Amino acid sequence: KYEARIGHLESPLQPRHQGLEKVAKLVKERTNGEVEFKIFPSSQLGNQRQMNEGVQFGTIEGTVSAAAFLGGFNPVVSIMDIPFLLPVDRAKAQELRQGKFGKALLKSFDSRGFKAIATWPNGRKNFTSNKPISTIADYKGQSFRVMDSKILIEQFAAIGASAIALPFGELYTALQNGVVDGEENPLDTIQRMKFYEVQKYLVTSEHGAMEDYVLFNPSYWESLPENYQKIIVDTFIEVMPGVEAHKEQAQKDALEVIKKAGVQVTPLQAADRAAMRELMYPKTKAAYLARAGAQGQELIKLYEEEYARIV
Numbered sequence: 001k002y003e004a005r006i007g008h009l010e011s012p013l014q015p016r017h018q019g020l021e022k023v024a025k026l027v028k029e030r031t032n033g034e035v036e037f038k039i040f041p042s043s044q045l046g047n048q049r050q051m052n053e054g055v056q057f058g059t060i061e062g063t064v065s066a067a068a069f070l071g072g073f074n075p076v077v078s079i080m081d082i083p084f085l086l087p088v089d090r091a092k093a094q095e096l097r098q099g100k101f102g103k104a105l106l107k108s109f110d111s112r113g114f115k116a117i118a119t120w121p122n123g124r125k126n127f128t129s130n131k132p133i134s135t136i137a138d139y140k141g142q143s144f145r146v147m148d149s150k151i152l153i154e155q156f157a158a159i160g161a162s163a164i165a166l167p168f169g170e171l172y173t174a175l176q177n178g179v180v181d182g183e184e185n186p187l188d189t190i191q192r193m194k195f196y197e198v199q200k201y202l203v204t205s206e207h208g209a210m211e212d213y214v215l216f217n218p219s220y221w222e223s224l225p226e227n228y229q230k231i232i233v234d235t236f237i238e239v240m241p242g243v244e245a246h247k248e249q250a251q252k253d254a255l256e257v258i259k260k261a262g263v264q265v266t267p268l269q270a271a272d273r274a275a276m277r278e279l280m281y282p283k284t285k286a287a288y289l290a291r292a293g294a295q296g297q298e299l300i301k302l303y304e305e306e307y308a309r310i311v
């Protein structure tokens, strides 16, 4: 009775998709079989811009998108692209993500033609390249692919590197053919997309967050009885802790595979981490405010207040 086609970019093997399958099963049972989610991975329904427009228009009922692709439709959510924003402690990050701060980000979608019903962690990003990236000076003049975010372009600019937005489904080929030197992603994404076949170097950095937003077409959402709306939200929240543990463990598994495949892996040096943060924050925050305006200032303030309380 209430079928929803929900698309996303990732391999079906990864924790987001597995979690969405679990959500689908539980929602179908808890709604007397009436709400049926069908999940389409791997850009099957389009690249993320196409899926986002599809959800807004209602050609598809939903998408799970990284925040990094949503700043055109919703500049406010791009705060989540700022490097080194989240605490290292995952539980404290969750207090931010699931508390007043994250709630304000979900609410910001209402006026923009999406119903954002939940946000899930979905890993932290690491640098890869075909040129050495062992020191901060090494990044100068290199080019990196980013997700479709002006904030992420500024991230790389802050350390003298260039960045261009390329669709995820084209990324393997882009790396293979030297369209860019490098990219950034969680280790298990690097593994499942086989970016180790086309990148020689990896820096374990966790310098920025990959943040998932669960978006429904508003008319679809509104067509659902209230009790089903509540069941869906609660089910996403119920499945979340298992998804995060699967995602954390997948990074460990992925690192072993990446090292075995012959990628040179180094940790981000502490002084390089601090220097990156100090250079990247002003530029990425200014970019965020430039596009989000006063509402972005409001979210920065709310983040600072909640971070101080929590951390």
Ligand SMILES: O=C(O)c1cc(=O)[nH]c(=O)[nH]1
Pocket (backbone or CB within 6 Å): 009, 010, 065, 066, 147, 167, 168, 184, 185, 186, 189, 210
């Ligand atoms: O475009 C990407 O890099 C990307 C998208 C996505 O949904 N998940 C991910 O890990 N990376």
Ligand SMILES: [Cl-]
Pocket (backbone or CB within 6 Å): 009, 047, 048, 049, 166, 167, 168, 169
């Ligand atoms: Cl894409």
